[model samples]
Target chain A: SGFRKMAFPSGKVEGCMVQVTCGTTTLNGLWLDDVVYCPRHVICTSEDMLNPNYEDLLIRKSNHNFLVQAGNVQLRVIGHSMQNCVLKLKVDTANPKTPKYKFVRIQPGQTFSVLACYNGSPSGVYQCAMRPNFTIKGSFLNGSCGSVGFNIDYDCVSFCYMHHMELPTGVHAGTDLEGNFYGPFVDRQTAQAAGTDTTITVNVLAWLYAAVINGDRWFLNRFTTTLNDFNLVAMKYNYEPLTQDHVDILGPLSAQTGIAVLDMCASLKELLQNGMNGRTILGSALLEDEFTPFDVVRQCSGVTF
Target chain B: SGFRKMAFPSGKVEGCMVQVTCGTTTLNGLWLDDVVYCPRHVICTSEDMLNPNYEDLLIRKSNHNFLVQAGNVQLRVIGHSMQNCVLKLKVDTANPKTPKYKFVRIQPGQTFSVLACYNGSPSGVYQCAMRPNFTIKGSFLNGSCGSVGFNIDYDCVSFCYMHHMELPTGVHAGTDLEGNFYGPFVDRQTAQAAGTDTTITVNVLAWLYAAVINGDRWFLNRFTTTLNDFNLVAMKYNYEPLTQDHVDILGPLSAQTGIAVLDMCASLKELLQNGMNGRTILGSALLEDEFTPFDVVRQCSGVTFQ
Candidate 1:
């Protein structure tokens, strides 16, 4: 039978990492570089190439998309690979000879995903590549290749995984308590001036979501108590004091996504209800006004945000 | 028959100005040597004396008290007559022999009252005398009078007239509506700071009371628009912006007295409620907080006497 038999890598080389950019300048839409970052991560890919019945992937903050949008960045891969895979990132520049690229783990019949934040700095150039389904020849692209050169800075900062636990419903990015540190990926860029309060609020929320939904009691107690630390910091910064009631109201909403969306006005009353007056909304016009109750609290408060 | 029996002298004298001094260091109670000053244009007699009631006397602006208290100096009588009379004042220091005297007025059956400020230059002595009430010999007291002299430096000044109609009802002093002011007396000194706003507020109140009670149209109008002026001044001071409503609220209450009382807290809502971040409550802590609000306003307000 004088014909070359195709010996493609099997389950061990099940998939490869791909790249993705804000195709529509939006977090979600008909994503570009279809089948790029995650094998089943987007709709552009179908089951024909082992991606049979690929479910729709939502552009969410828990995974890489939010990390990109949160940090004012983007993502993608080095070459086109028609392989089932996941997107992953790590920062070990120790090997100048070969800055190794890591992969976001993907199971044969499972979903693909990634986490972000605790890894690369927002301002660094990342090394990217594909695995298994495509072949690589030391700095060169071969099998399952295309004429198009791939934009390899598939910027992923978290070594993401599926929180699709034992009978889990959907996958999430941040609720990882098992990693080197709290789900090593998150939106890295934050408004640091006049508002470290908002960022800390987000972190506690991330871990809290982990503790509640997945029952990570370490984080349950971990995040529950981290919120305590958050309050201490908030009070130090002259922000409103916090109570469990506030958390009760705000928790589930944050569990939706590890980061809590800050609503300035809604929280103002309880913050100053007692007239403690320790608020400092100094730099954010986003939080103050002169003709309302908003104005009253601003002046009488010992500090104003 | 009564006329023939007396045989007293005829009108050799039309009438005379009288003399009095700063009666005592005190008032009302234990009034010192108490009785006191001034004269007027009246019918004079030769002391058949008990000839009864003397009418038609005008209020004057000086007396032995005013003269001594008026002139750049003070008063005395050339003659003594133990008869009822008036105290009068003139600024004419024309007599080289004497630094002539001036007067504060007096009248019949009336409590004695005198005018100050106009004649005296803030500090001076005055001349004094009497007609039928006491006798005088030369420049001193003699008959119906004590050999003891009177205190005529008559340290007097209207005590100052009522701004009569003004200052803030809320603790201020100085607003006058009509003439011969100071109708109502008040708690004397106040914090001499930026709070004149309260003084004027009371002044309007005082007149508001006048217009309502006496139905004085002039003050009725005087007070009507005076609130308008207070509004202007209040705006300049950056106090809370006032609406006609506030005046309406504060107005009727003022009718009780010629001067209104000060309610330092009533307006607190509009003043600091929104928390405009204003309020320089620094130096005014005294007028701001006394032992209490009512206490502070009561004493600080212009209606104080009322």
Candidate 2:
């Protein structure tokens, strides 16, 4: 459903599962942390800063720098350990509207981690929330809004990245896991400190519309009338346009805003079941059929630049 | 004509004329000598090793170590200043019956040389040799048969080379300046020595036959007769099969060895004209079109390794 096995360590399973692929070897090695076997998209790690336990929540582990190709659906804590506090998990949202999976509490040096996978399809948005009564321990090592709202159509992958506030990697500069973006930190020892408070803010209206779109029709009517207040959440922080294969998941509301919102569990699965880079996709560079200079120039002349 | 300009320095042309494209930055800089404008094939020089003035004939300076692609015709000297000792040149060979451009005479020191470009096509052979009266001064500063005896056919270029006495960035490994190849050297005191003791032992019969192929019809008979003795010298020392484009340059006697000989030339050309790695003309690894993994895989399928 993403970069192939070759894109990650051959065979390994342990501490972490956040594997970021589709980059150079040397660069990938840098993100593999201590637990290099797992391939992941979202993660919250301990201050140790190595693998499962020893690392930052987003950047190195959650990987907001690498291109998150399509075909991915699910947000798992590849690495996490919130000393005394616990964080709640959500694939496309942290609001009370979406399903509640579980709390993330992980702490390991490198070779160990509470490896888990949380489903996040149809609505690729993923989020983590602070549990009730949970407070920061001695200090906050780091925090990140582990989310996913876009995909780099593996069928036509494009890298998304940002440098400082000036963006070039195609990723919008904002908080939340979208494309390859994550930001908007709060005051701390340092604004750009490795470990700090991270934020995630997006309209939760679509969450409500999607929650009952297929569940109940009468509720759908009430939701429909209650729509004007719920503006379609724009897909920000993307290197390229939303995939060309945009599927319709939202009920009658989809006709207005072209998005695959709210079909609930089974519906989310269907939208990306055959999605390019979503949950089930397979292909790479060496998969082409012709490579001659003349042929290549000829074919690409009319298509991609 | 040659590799892309991008293959060479983005923008540089100073001390050298031997700008080989797209190798290593440092390596390209090495050939980016001083006078890098005029395209050349053969050169006579002394051993100071700079450009146009400091080195020997072809290869080494002309780089026989560089990978020679297709579409090449002239034998050029990158650096040279051969000491006083006129060296003659010839590719393949020069026959009394064929077109004789001129005699090869090379002799100079560190910073002085009468650079030259000899065309090696149609028949595709280049060479340089010793001139009369000019005796070796002091010693022999090793010399290669400054020759352009092959054609790197862009569409179908071929490189001719020597073996044992192997050579190119443009030479084959047999005998002669075929493609991208340079000959190894022996220990010497005169870095700018004289009398390279240049070696080439072949039959001279065709030398007379080709000389007259364009001259007379009746004479063609004799020239043809002379070719039998010549046996149409074949340039072995290649990675691929000989070209299948051999054309007869002899008269009636050509009918016999013409198949085996002219065919020899075209065949050798076929071997390297478009040779990708010089060793194998298969695979477009560097040649990409819509460079995708799938396209490349399919294009190279059943052709490369399993």
Candidate 3:
């Protein structure tokens, strides 16, 4: 069951003019090879054309007919090569009722849709003026019938997507600890993972140490003291265990001072070396709490490590 | 010929001492290198020591003869260097006049002439301090001098070059033009060399022309008619080879206008180019009188140069 499909005439129709008329005016409708109608228009009923939804009519004019007649009987012919032609119509010649026309504004690499229509007797000639907005005045064939008119409607939807982003204010927490560390997550993911507790800690610490240091205080400050200070103190004291009281004092003191517990213990040792009796040294009262025993005494005074 | 000179012993002499006595109280006097004595004492005259008219004295105390003396006598050694040496001289110890011994205030870098005159009793050992102004003091031999005194007199003289051109404001008869010029002066050397009569002609011409052009009658008028009127006339005619009548009108016009001749000429040129013509143009009246036959003919034919 082979269906015979009729093909429109092809090949170059050089200098061929298709006349479209609105009222008494005539216009070059289109060239030989161009989309003469949209798929939607092919299926459109006479009812659809009479009722004339703006979108459907627009699509009908843009994707289907190169020449469309508007309600005012003006004939508008739009095509790639239809420039510099004369416009002819006599529909509404008075102020403000005339068709307001505009070109299809688009970026360099974009394609947009435009609606052009003429309303009148649909049999008049129109001249295309060489100006922006693509204005056309129609001329009646007999110069007696009413004027033809047209309006071009275009959608500039495609240009809306080209915008830039606003960056967040401060250093991200992950990068706060080490500037070179790239994303384990994007900002939103990182915020989600940080949770309320960690955020609170960071905010509080940031405020407390605002004058001295800047970072995501909960994570960056802890990461720094633990990695550098605490380890240094521990290594200097030969990794001897600290008692509960020493642990309480040193841990809290280190957390507050941004020094590690191990660094505080090492500082104690340095104090002793400098002939500072424990009771006489400034801030030594900080070491009298209950977290752990001092490591040096545990190791050197014949106490269990 | 080279002359040989003997070197004298010259250096600080140490431990030298002198004494000045006032009644029973004695004070040690300071020793200085060179001492001066009265010109009269050295010359043995009544000359005033203060006003010594350029006379001086030199003494060799080291070459003087001395005598050993005994008793309560006042002894003063007024030599350059007599340190740690002892001398005894006999004196009338009970005499109401205990010998007044005074050492002159001597400064470094001076010379003195010493003389010893012993007339049985001990002579006074008097030392005199000398400055540029001569003065003297006296003392006895045994450091028993109450006081010594002197005076000084001198003069000083103290000693500057002092110079007056006339220039005129503008051009004058028999004088070079001081103001700026309008055009090339071909007769500049002749005019400068001319006598008073020629100078008067030039100065009067300059003054009149300058006055007429710069007059209020010209500048205060309308641009197109008044100012432009003169401009057009001037441009259309050639006033070269100025005549006596031309000078008559132009001179007073210039005097009345008070504009520099050169500036007036330039303004006229501009007005003509811009097609300005007016009453003030004729008001100067210089143009009509100054118009030559060539100028009149050119104007009648409405001829203009390219």
Candidate 4:
């Protein structure tokens, strides 16, 4: 069973932490069973999450009174509708070769949320997948939702938001027939700074959207090659509509840090059309809910509309 | 003054030879004269006169036993007519190098006869000139007369007679153009059988005639070169129109021999008028009065005609 609520607190937990979960028990049957759970309720603590060295962790945590970690968490469906779903959590710390992670079973409409805490490095990458088979068609058939590792404000960077806002736009440098070479730039800073590392994400997005709009299968092959190389810190595929689950995981973080979490359905629809042509259709720069500075920075660095 | 009449008896002459001179009498003011004389007259003891050696002469002589020569003797002028002329005879045995000969002036219409006794070799050649100093014109002006020679027959064998009759008609052999060559062919039997040693005497008659006839001078040049060792002999001029002196020197031999003597006048006229085409007109052939053989023989002999 999972708690059902309309809203969650909007302040930072004492150690910057929060958690939430959901299952089919809110609908018909307990599809999730005991497959997924949140082991700790703390906000932040000293623990070697990614290849942690225990001695270095002890040295750092011995003098610290409290740990900083993830607080606000939310979940929502990425598709057009919902049906039966499940969620599970798995851990592999003992082997030191693999790590523990969560797997969510999404049918038609369902979601789960949790606070993620780590020590040593404040940065971490998170990903959620559907159980049995984690195919995008199974979980995010209509349009998937996901987030960047952390929000610049309160927003969870959904796949739709990333598609429109995170992807920069530009005319293919050189002539149209010659096509454009997009980047391997690692981040927005690298793209914006006085450097040669302009990001390729926007180009990838434009190419993908172009393929979809033009129905050119050849562009799909190029897009797939790009998608295969895209390195991200966190990924989630929400299968339920935006509801209390969205607020519980993303609202508190927005209130506490003045950040925003993208609405996957709305962003994706707007992006599929306007973002393909390099325009903003919803949200604003003040709210930090439109295409992010990362995208704007990459676009400005290139030949774009 | 010139002698009115002179007699030459048979035995008094060793060779049947005599010299009679004819000229203006600047030495003696005579129309004709006998300045020096050696008679070749033989006194025929009836036997000698009956002998075949003197038969032809005896047959033509008068009852007084003077032998006269016989045959067809005539002068035919082939060019413009001529006027006063003289005929002379000369004989000498005195000097071996410069034998003296007689020169005679032939009077118009006078007949000078030639008489020679051939007892040994019966062949002789003679050169006859017409008007030695008088300029003679050829059919073409500036042309000089080539020399002329004659062939006489004193005694004849049958084959030789046929040869004489066929003797290429004119001066058909030898090198000199005007010199004449003749043969007696007087073998013992033929001479006795014919009852004569063929006494031939030509009367030097006045006004030998000649004319200009046109011929291919180019062919004539080639013909001469072919026969004359490439010498350009054909270019020599042949004179036309005989003079009185011309008749005097050559007329006697011509008349007494009964052979036709062609003066340069006749020869050049014949040549220019093409009258001598394919026939001998000049050279030894003309001297011998023999017809010309075609120059084609030169082609067969690989001789250059020009």
Candidate 3 is scored at a TM of: 0.10
Q: Over the stretch B1-306, how does candidate 3's per-residue lDDT look in tens digits?
A: 000010110001101123322223232222222221111112112232233222232122121222212123344433322111111212222223222223233321122211111121111111122211221211122221211221111110000000000002112111011111112211121232211111112222342243333232343322322334443454354322323444444444444455434444455445335533423332231221222222222222222110
Q: lDDT per residue, candidate 4, A1-305, as tens digits?
A: 00001011111111122122221101001112221122111111223222333234323322122221122222221211111111112211121211122222222111111111222111111122111111111111001111111111221211111100111221011000011111221112112211222222222232223223222222122111111112221112211223334334434323433323332223333333333232211111111121222222222222111
Question: Candidate 1 or 4, higher lDDT?
Answer: 1
Runs in model 1 lying further than 4 Å from the true structure:
A1-305, B1-72, B75-88, B94-279, B285-306
Give the Å error, residue A241, model 2. Answer: 83
Residue-by-residue lDDT tens digits, candidate 1, B1-306 = 000000001000001112233332111000011122222112222241224233421222124323232222333323222222222223333223221123223211111111111111110011111111111111110111111111111121111111111122222122111112121322222222222112223222322332233322222221222444445645554443445544455554444444433332222222323332322221111111111112112212311010
lDDT of 1 by residue, A137-235 (tens): 111111111101111112222232311111011111221212211122221222212112121232233223322332222211112234455566566
TM-score of each: 0.16, 0.16, 0.10, 0.13
Candidate 2 lDDT over residue span A60-131, tens digit each: 533333332212322332343222111212222122212112222221100111111121111001111221
Q: Which lDDT value does model 1 have at B254?
A: 49
- Candidate 2 vs candidate 4: the TM-score winner is 2
Model 1 chain A weakest lDDT span, ten residues long:
A1-10
Report the candidate with higher TM-score, 2 versus 3. 2
The alpha-carbon lDDT assigned to residue B274 of candidate 3 equals 52
CAPRI rating of model 1: incorrect
Q: How well is candidate 2 docked (DockQ)?
A: 0.01
